[PDB]
């Protein structure tokens, strides 16, 4: 396109001039055909829409349906003169209130996360420089039009997509738009076919690091590369989270069980003699009863606790559902430049004394340092310190050297920081050697030179330091410094130099040659007139000091984080827009490519065979570049991914990152994407969990991501994986605890309807159990520690390992819940018989018991009871059933602490939150029973102490049964007991 186009073919397409520029009238009229040079702001969801979305979800919709059923049943009963219709209203109000309060909590979490994220969002207007009708005036960037001729200089943002017409030493920072870590030279010659890899196109969002350039605006606003990436990301749909899918499956299980029980007991009520309307009301009551009121709040609170624990590590989630995706993740598609690496060129390797040394590249200097005890090292340090014009900003002593700011080249910055870290006081050392002559890094010479004077006042020599390309310093440098000696070149040192340079280049690093020359005082006395244009000083016959290479190195915690993720069974794929050699070197450095794993190119080079003659299955590693990825179809991409465990994608466009993520997801995996730049925003949006760096990340990446790492710490990924697995297990335990008590809440109603006993448990006391006494114990299970090494297990199978499954449901409902129902009914009949109502008399008693016209109903002793006295006895039954459920739930919370381990191994009291929750539950039970006014306010009665003792053997039975079940599971793995009785 415009890069593949001469100025003759330009200058007419846009009706402009290469030097005069667009006319001031044509530009004004073009700003009407095309809008301002600015990206379109995103769609924008209003706050009420955000809150309404919080008011939705699978459990929320189930609760809405339950409340609607409650109101419909209320209407049906009111069309029949029923009395106990306040229960329907209470249930509907409770369900709606729980949904609304949980939605408010979630919306507040979203709002706070947005506030913290936008806190670090920087804002500033941007200018430009345009030459219209000859006048080179300064204009705002958004007034630019396609065809405008603009000028760029170092430190200015590129104002738009520009075809470069003239440039002098112009370099651009493309690390955010592309993956290129190194500064990219911009020249008006069309180099590559595509505009993304050519040298004559500068991009809208990028930085002009150095030099000056001039060019023609070729795209504007949303037609720029970054605007098109924004458009591509806007069209990416955000799919459901794994925890949301699990919740939906659990809601389906609840609905199925509710419908089954409702239909069964509807048939039973019809066969017993109930009218059709009454049987339908019974069906509706059962269906509503199967819906747990407090479970939504419990799940929300547990997710919020996990989010708080993550935020304690500077890891902020934008929604509460994102705290589990990392635990469920099996593939991490990671960006390289700026995500795995520091996006900062630093000195990594040195070749002096015929040996390759390794420098400490971590930003906190937490690594090892090379041997600095030598004389060649001192000479090399002097050469690289003196032959440097970069300087730190004044007023920098708190900031560490890697994170200081210096004015100069990227390579000069790396050399200055290396000198400051090794020698210390680089600027003072350089000023202690006054400079009398210098030669900048011109293109023809391809080296930088400077002559200095030694620090001691007794050595009148002049030192000439020269830094440049390796195969431009080697054409000079007849001598080489090794172990302080000045041995000359015997072609053996040339072979060694070539080998070292080739190895460092193959390591994806930029190498620089350094040398010194001690000018003689006899030939060059002090005060010598050194002329840059006369070549009066010796520019040949130098002494080579050493080779220094630079790379964009990984962050300090990245290699350990990658190793931990791979230990957890997560596949790590590198996907970068950077060059393949650098990508492969970084992948080997961080552990994405393991030691000893080879590509087909590596095997071919080792076996001296062509690339087409090597078995692909023999290569564990693979590097696929963007052009190859263009030709491969989904079948070949799937085959490559499933053939090579250690995969690296280099020169990958944002669309291709999205394609790779989509392929991994289509293979059935839960995919995490970590990125910082705009080039991974579509991939971050498509990922099941998107993680963006807080400091290095672009605004588009941070908007696309669900997780933000505020400190740019990659180990937070392993923290999130561990927390997600822990929250999955603890949510399983908490849901089992919550579901257990539903059966003892429902069975009294079933017996009330079918056997016609007086109502053993009321709606108000059921609501108290659901929303007051058990929420805290259920939440306390989120603090349970892992029962095994959770970080050494594989990721769960999303289709086979559900959050709630048949063993959990069956156990919690029909074994522990059955025991709780039996305890409640034992207490009910004990309290009834000790007040004068034997069980046989209780059977079939409901019509007389509830008859308001019967004021002398006879009990088992012949005593006559009024309706009010019978109602107080009914409230006593409510209270004893409530207390039975409470004690059995204490036992239940004790047994739900572990799924395989014994309580005697995990620790009875090591969960202090759980102990406090048990005490809190008992205290509220006592308060409800024995507070004055409770019988007429909440229908709780001051029950006798033996009503407390009756359910205690059943609670002990629950504990002993669970202990025996888990002992059988531990002692016989893989047996029938393990397959059927383990959840």
């Amino acid at each position: 396109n415009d890069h593949q186009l001469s100025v003759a073919e330009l200058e007419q397409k846009y009706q402009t001039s290469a030097t005069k520029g667009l006319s001031a009238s044509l530009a004004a009229e073009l700003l009407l055909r095309d809008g301002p040079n600015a990206l379109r702001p995103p769609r924008g969801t209003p706050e009420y829409v955000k809150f309404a979305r919080q008011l939705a979800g699978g459990l929320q919709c189930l609760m809405w349906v339950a409340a609607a059923i409650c109101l419909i049943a209320f209407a049906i009963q009111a069309s029949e003169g029923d009395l106990t219709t306040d229960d329907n209203l209470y249930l509907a109000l409770a369900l709606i209130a729980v949904v609304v309060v949980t939605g408010c909590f979630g919306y507040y979490q979203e709002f706070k996360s947005t506030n913290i994220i936008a806190s670090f969002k920087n804002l500033v207007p941007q200018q430009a420089t345009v030459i219209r009708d000859g006048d080179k005036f300064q204009i705002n960037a958004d007034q630019l039009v396609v065809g405008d001729l603009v000028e760029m200089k170092g430190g200015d943002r590129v104002p738009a997509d520009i075809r470069i017409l003239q440039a002098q030493g112009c370099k651009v920072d493309n690390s955010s738009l592309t993956g290129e870590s190194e500064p990219q030279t911009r020249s008006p010659e069309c180099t590559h076919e595509s505009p993304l890899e050519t040298r004559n196109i500068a991009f809208f969002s990028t930085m002009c690091l150095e030099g000056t350039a001039q060019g023609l605006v070729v795209n504007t606003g949303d037609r720029t590369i970054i605007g098109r990436i924004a458009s591509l990301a806007s069209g990416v749909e955000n799919e459901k989270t794994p925890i949301a899918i699990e919740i939906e499956h659990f809601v389906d299980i609840i609905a199925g069980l509710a419908i089954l029980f409702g239909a069964t007991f509807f048939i039973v009520a019809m066969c017993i003699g109930y009218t059709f309307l009454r049987a339908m009301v019974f069906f509706m009551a059962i269906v509503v009863a199967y819906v747990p009121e407090g479970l939504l709040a419990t799940v929300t609170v547990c997710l919020s606790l996990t989010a708080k624990r993550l935020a304690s590590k500077n890891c902020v989630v934008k929604n509460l559902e994102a705290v589990e995706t990392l635990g469920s993740t099996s593939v991490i598609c990671s960006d390289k430049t700026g995500t795995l690496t520091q996006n900062r060129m630093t000195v990594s390797h040195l070749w002096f004394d015929n040996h390759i040394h390794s420098a400490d590249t971590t930003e906190d200097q937490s690594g090892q340092t090379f041997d600095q005890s030598s004389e060649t090292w001192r000479a090399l340090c002097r050469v690289l310190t003196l032959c440097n014009r970069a300087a730190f900003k004044s007023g920098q002593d708190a900031v560490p050297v890697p994170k200081r700011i210096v004015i100069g080249d990227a390579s000069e910055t790396a050399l200055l920081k290396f000198s400051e870290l090794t020698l210390g006081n680089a600027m003072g050392y350089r000023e202690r050697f006054p400079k009398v002559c210098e030669i900048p890094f011109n293109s023809t010479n391809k080296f930088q030179l400077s002559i200095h004077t030694l620090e001691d006042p007794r050595d009148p020599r002049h030192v000439l330091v020269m830094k440049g390309a390796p195969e431009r310093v080697l054409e000079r440098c007849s001598s080489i410094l090794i172990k302080g000696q000045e041995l000359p070149l015997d072609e053996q040192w040339r072979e060694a130099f070539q080998t070292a340079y080739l190895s460092l280049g193959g390591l994806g690093e930029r190498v620089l040659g350094f040398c010194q020359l001690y000018l003689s005082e006899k030939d060059y006395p002090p005060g010598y007139a050194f002329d840059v244009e006369a070549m009066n000083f010796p520019t040949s016959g130098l002494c080579f000091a050493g080779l220094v290479s630079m790379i964009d190195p990984p962050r300090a915690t990245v290699p350990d984080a990658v190793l931990k993720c791979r230990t957890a069974g997560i596949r790590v794929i590198m996907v970068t827009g950077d060059h393949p050699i650098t990508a492969k070197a970084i992948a080997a450095s961080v552990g994405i490519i393991s030691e000893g794993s080879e590509t087909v190119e590596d095997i071919a080079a080792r076996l001296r065979v062509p690339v087409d003659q090597v078995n692909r299955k023999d290569a564990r590693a693979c590097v696929i570049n963007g052009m190859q990825l263009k030709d491969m179809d989904p079948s070949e991409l799937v085959e490559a991914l499933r053939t090579h465990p250690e995969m690296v994608f280099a020169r990958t466009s944002p669309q291709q990152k999205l394609v790779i993520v989509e392929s991994c997801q289509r293979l059935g995996a839960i995919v995490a994407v970590t990125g910082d730049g705009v080039n991974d925003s579509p991939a971050l949006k498509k990922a099941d969990i998107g993680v963006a760096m807080g400091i290095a990340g672009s605004d588009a990446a941070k908007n696309a991501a669900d997780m933000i790492l505020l400190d740019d710490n990659f180990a937070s990924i392993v923290t999130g994986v561990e927390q997600g697995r822990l929250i999955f297990d603890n949510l399983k335990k908490s849901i089992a605890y919550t579901l257990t008590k539903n059966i003892p809440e429902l069975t009294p109603y079933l017996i009330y309807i079918t056997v016609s006993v007086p109502l053993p448990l009321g709606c108000i006391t059921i609501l108290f159990i659901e929303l007051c006494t058990d929420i805290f114990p259920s939440v306390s299970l989120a603090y349970e520690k892992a029962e095994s090494d959770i970080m050494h297990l594989r990721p769960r199978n999303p289709k086979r390992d559900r959050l709630v499954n048949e063993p959990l449901a069956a156990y919690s409902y029909f074994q522990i819940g059955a025991i709780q129902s039996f305890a409640g009914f034992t207490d009910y009949f004990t309290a009834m018989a000790q007040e004068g109502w034997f069980p046989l008399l209780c059977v079939g008693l409901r019509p007389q018991w509830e008859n308001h016209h019967l004021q002398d109903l006879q009990d088992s002793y012949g005593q006559e009871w009024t309706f009010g006295q019978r109602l107080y006895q009914q409230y006593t039954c409510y209270t004893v059933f409530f207390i039975s459920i409470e004690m059995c739930q204490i036992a239940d919370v004790l047994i739900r602490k572990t799924r395989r381990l014994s309580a005697f191994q995990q620790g009875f009291f090591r969960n202090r939150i759980l102990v406090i929750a048990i005490v809190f539950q008992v205290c509220i039970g006592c308060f409800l029973c024995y507070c004055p006014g409770m019988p007429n306010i909440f229908n709780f009665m001051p029950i006798r102490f033996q009503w407390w003792l009756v359910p205690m053997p059943f609670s002990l039975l629950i504990f002993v049964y669970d202990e025996i079940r888990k002992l059988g599971v531990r002692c016989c793995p893989g047996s029938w007991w393990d397959q059927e009785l383990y959840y």
Partner: protein, 268 residues
């Protein structure tokens, strides 16, 4: 999911074992529950309830009992016998259980104080109960007036106190029925009642009640309140309370405890 080899994700043999496990579990749990109920019933006392927590003061009922919307509501027409035929029929049915034939299982009592029986000396290991026949209600007894005063606008209402095992109303004087207007019609006098038995008392030898096992023939003593000055074509509210030392009628959550309140209207 339903498949021949695997029926809802489980083979037929495995379904058998899991169903057998659940059957055994529920059989054991039902056995434990039945044993608990058996132990409870073997610790329950046949004659005296363990606790009387809900029975502190006895309830009071009225015959004939006709309930309107919020409670007892009796309305009839003197000119129309079909309005009180049902009321008199209810009274006759109630007093059917108070004939001497119905009372052959009880004894004559002349003590006028507590019938305190510590042993079982009535036949079939039973305690004695006193007779209350429908002749102690004299005029309101149904003879020689089979209308119970309803025909002549002076209806008789039988007030019965709920029986509680071992409850003692108070032996200083016999518990006594007092009937009055709730809010007296300001245009008329206070309610004029005259009672059967005289003074509207329950004799103290009907207490204590020992329960239906010890006293299978026990009959609650009755008091008939004949109202003599109820205004015609007007709604009145009558409250009949029990005056005993250990009977209270101030509970605001049970309007039948210690008293009975009904609306009355006699049209002409």
């Amino acid at each position: 999911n339903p498949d021949t080899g695997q029926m809802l994700g489980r083979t037929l043999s495995r379904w058998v074992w899991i169903s057998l496990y659940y059957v055994a579990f529920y059989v054991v749990m039902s056995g434990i529950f039945a044993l608990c109920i058996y132990v409870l019933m073997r610790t329950i006392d046949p004659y005296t309830p363990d606790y009387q927590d809900q029975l502190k003061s006895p309830g009071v009922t009225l015959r004939p009992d006709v309930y309107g919307e919020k409670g007892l509501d009796i309305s009839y027409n003197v000119s129309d016998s079909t309005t009180w035929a049902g009321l008199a029929h209810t009274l006759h049915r109630f007093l059917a259980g108070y004939s001497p034939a119905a009372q052959e299982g009880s004894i004559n009592c002349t003590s006028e104080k507590y019938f305190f029986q510590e042993s079982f000396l009535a036949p079939n290991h039973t305690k004695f109960s006193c007779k209350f026949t429908a002749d102690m209600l004299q005029n309101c007894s149904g003879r020689p007036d089979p209308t119970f005063g309803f025909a002549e606008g002076k209806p008789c209402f039988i007030i019965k106190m709920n029986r509680i095992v071992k409850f003692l109303p108070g032996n200083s004087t016999a518990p006594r029925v007092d009937c009055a207007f709730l809010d007296q019609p300001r245009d008329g006098p206070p309610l004029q009642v005259e009672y059967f038995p005289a003074n509207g008392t329950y004799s103290l030898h009907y207490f204590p009640y020992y329960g239906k096992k010890a006293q299978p023939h026990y009959s609650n003593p009755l008091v008939a309140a004949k109202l003599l000055n109820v205004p015609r074509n007007r709604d009145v509210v009558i409250v009949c309370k029990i005056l005993a030392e250990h009977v209270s009628f101030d509970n605001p959550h049970d309007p039948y405890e210690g008293k009975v309140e009904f609306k009355l209207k006699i049209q002409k």
